[PDB]
């Protein structure tokens, strides 16, 4: 139903009209009137606020409010509501996350990796599986993943050449991503990477002490000193574009603005630092008690974010990027289990890398190419329009849709929202909105 969200952040009052995507910057009196506008008449509102605002200035702000509602920018209704009643939608797989190896040279503690190389034959099966399951979609994505993919880099190159040849016959266009811990980068494979990887993700958690506390070799020592210069080299050889450094923050580093700003101070223009996934009973998960400190941390990062963009020493922070010009997105989410699937070196298919450890979620194996459609449709139909909690949530059209892995990890049910996750996600959106308001 019709719904707004309003918040006040660092002095700016912001109003979100949920169904239309309209976003407004309002003065204090409008902010206060909005507490009452739907359930009270103009006369009752004038009496309820008369201790603070005179009747003329209230009617003035009032005359602006229903003018905005008359044109669909406040308390608008949902135009996509009637259409969504579809559950027979054939899913189209658009991307595969290839676990190129389950071995690694680190024992990062928050990681699912804490085994086998994928054969070129399995990788070729994964390509052919993605072509037959992508239907008539030309643009396909392959993320080279796993434990550490560069420990099986020859198979990565054969997969690319294989897929690059299948493009002509099937009118496909593959875009390849590589995510690496960096330990095995060098001049020669970075040259290949800049010729062939449309995107590369470089894993580093921020300050050296934060990074080397979590991202640990089998002997127990840190990796910051080794990977940092390699990452700056990669960043600069790609003109500070088409990459990002990717950190994970846990309960151990809740002052994570310090880590984002450390990566910024080291020259990285493209940064993503994200909360740990599936960390139940780990000692790491952010808890409900931690939300006030994390909220203040996002706000202090946003303020500094605006300041550096104003002064010119800019950097991009993935969770602050947002498009204020926008049904397909509201039904898909991250796509795990239906549009986005992970493949093990053995070739087994899972919804995403966070489910690979659980055969209850195995959906088939690419060497045969026969996907369990019931699991695919179950993940497909678990989305923002079908979860009851999302239906009353103001961020439903801005959020990334939730994380099935978190949901299963904390409630053993992909359809139950992970509350800590939602509140962090809603606060991030609030910050991204305040940033847009600061840069009118």
């Amino acid at each position: 139903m019709a719904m707004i969200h309003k918040f006040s952040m660092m002095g700016t009052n912001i109003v979100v009209d949920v169904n239309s995507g309209a976003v407004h910057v309002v003065d204090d009196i409008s902010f206060d009137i909005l507490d009452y506008y739907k359930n009270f008449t103009a006369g009752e509102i004038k009496n309820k606020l008369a201790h603070k605002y005179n009747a003329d200035e209230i009617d003035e702000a009032l005359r602006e409010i229903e003018s905005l509602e008359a044109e669909g920018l406040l308390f608008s209704e949902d135009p996509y509501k009637e259409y969504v009643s579809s559950m027979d939608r054939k899913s189209v797989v658009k991307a595969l996350c290839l676990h190129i190896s389950h071995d690694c040279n680190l024992r990062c503690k928050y990681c699912f990796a804490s085994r086998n190389m994928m054969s070129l034959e399995v990788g070729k099966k994964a390509i052919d599986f993605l072509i037959s399951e992508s239907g008539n979609r030309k643009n396909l994505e392959i993320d080279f993943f796993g434990g550490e993919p560069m420990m099986n880099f020859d198979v990565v190159k054969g997969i690319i050449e294989y897929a690059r040849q299948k493009e002509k016959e099937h009118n496909k266009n593959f875009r390849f991503t590589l995510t690496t811990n960096g330990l095995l980068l060098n001049d020669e494979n970075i040259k290949y990477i800049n010729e062939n990887m449309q995107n590369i993700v470089l894993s580093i958690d921020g300050r050296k002490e934060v990074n080397d506390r979590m991202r640990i070799r089998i002997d127990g020592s840190g990796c910051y000193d080794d990977i940092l210069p390699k990452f700056k080299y990669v960043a600069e050889s790609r003109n500070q574009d088409n990459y990002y450094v990717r950190g994970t923050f846990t309960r151990e580093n809740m002052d994570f603005s310090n880590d984002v700003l450390h990566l910024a101070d080291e020259g990285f223009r493209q940064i993503s630092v994200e909360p740990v996934v599936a960390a139940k009973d780990s000692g790491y998960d952010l808890r409900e008690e931690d939300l006030p400190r994390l909220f203040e941390e996002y706000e202090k990062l946003a303020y500094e974010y605006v300041k550096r963009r104003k002064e010119g020493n800019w950097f991009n922070f993935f969770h602050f990027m947002i498009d204020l010009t926008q049904i397909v997105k509201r039904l898909t989410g991250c796509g795990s289990g239906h549009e986005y699937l992970a493949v093990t070196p053995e070739g087994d298919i899972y919804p995403c890398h966070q489910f690979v450890g659980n055969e209850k979620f195995k959906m088939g194996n690419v060497k045969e190419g026969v996907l369990n459609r019931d699991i695919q449709n179950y993940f497909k139909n678990s989305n923002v329009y079908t979860k009851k909690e999302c239906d009353s949530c103001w961020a439903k059209f801005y959020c990334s849709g939730g994380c099935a892995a978190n949901s299963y990890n904390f409630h053993k049910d992909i359809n139950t929202v992970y509350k800590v996750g939602c509140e962090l996600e809603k606060k991030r959106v609030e910050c991204a909105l305040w940033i847009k308001a600061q840069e009118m």
Binding site: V26, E64, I65
Partner: peptide
């Protein structure tokens, strides 16, 4: 307006 100002007119 005067009291309102319209702003828009991982894995």
């Amino acid at each position: 307006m005067k009291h309102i100002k319209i702003l828009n007119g991982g894995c």
